[PDB]
Design a protein around this ligand. Structure first.
Ligand SMILES: *[C@@H]1O[C@H](CO)[C@@H](O)[C@H](O)[C@H]1NC(C)=O
Ligand SMILES: *[C@@H]1O[C@H](CO)[C@@H](O)[C@H](O)[C@H]1NC(C)=O
Lengths: 49, 49
């Protein structure tokens, strides 16, 4: 039937994110504050734009 | 501390009504403060929030 198994694993660590909570209370966006330079600006102004 | 269900039954009072509109001291399940309640129709509480 052309089916596949899949299990993706990545490690965890303690780190700081900026989470966006929408009108209903659902996390809709996130940014890892130390992954790039744009994420530095985004976590600094606390804005996704 | 001051949130949860492992309460100390040493000091005891009875459960009162959530009286809306007047400035009151509240002890809501461990949370303490002063304020004014307003009854609202919310749809963002899941079975864990
Ligand atoms: C599975 O993939 C092959 C690829 O050549 C195709 O020919 C075949 O029809 C596919 N079968 C099903 C059940 O999807
Ligand atoms: C102010 O007083 C009125 C009448 O005494 C009462 O109905 C109202 O709830 C009070 N409001 C506050 C905020 O205490």
């Amino acid at each position: 039937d052309n089916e596949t198994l899949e299990y993706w694993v990545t490690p965890l660590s303690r780190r700081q994110y900026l989470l966006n909570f929408d009108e209903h209370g659902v996390i809709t966006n996130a940014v890892d504050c130390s992954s790039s330079f744009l994420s530095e600006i985004q976590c600094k102004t606390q804005s996704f734009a | 501390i001051n949130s949860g269900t492992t309460c100390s039954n040493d000091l005891l009072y009875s459960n009162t009504e959530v009286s809306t509109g007047v400035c009151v001291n509240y002890d809501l399940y461990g949370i303490t403060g002063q304020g004014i309640f307003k009854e609202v129709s919310a749809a963002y509480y899941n079975n864990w929030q």
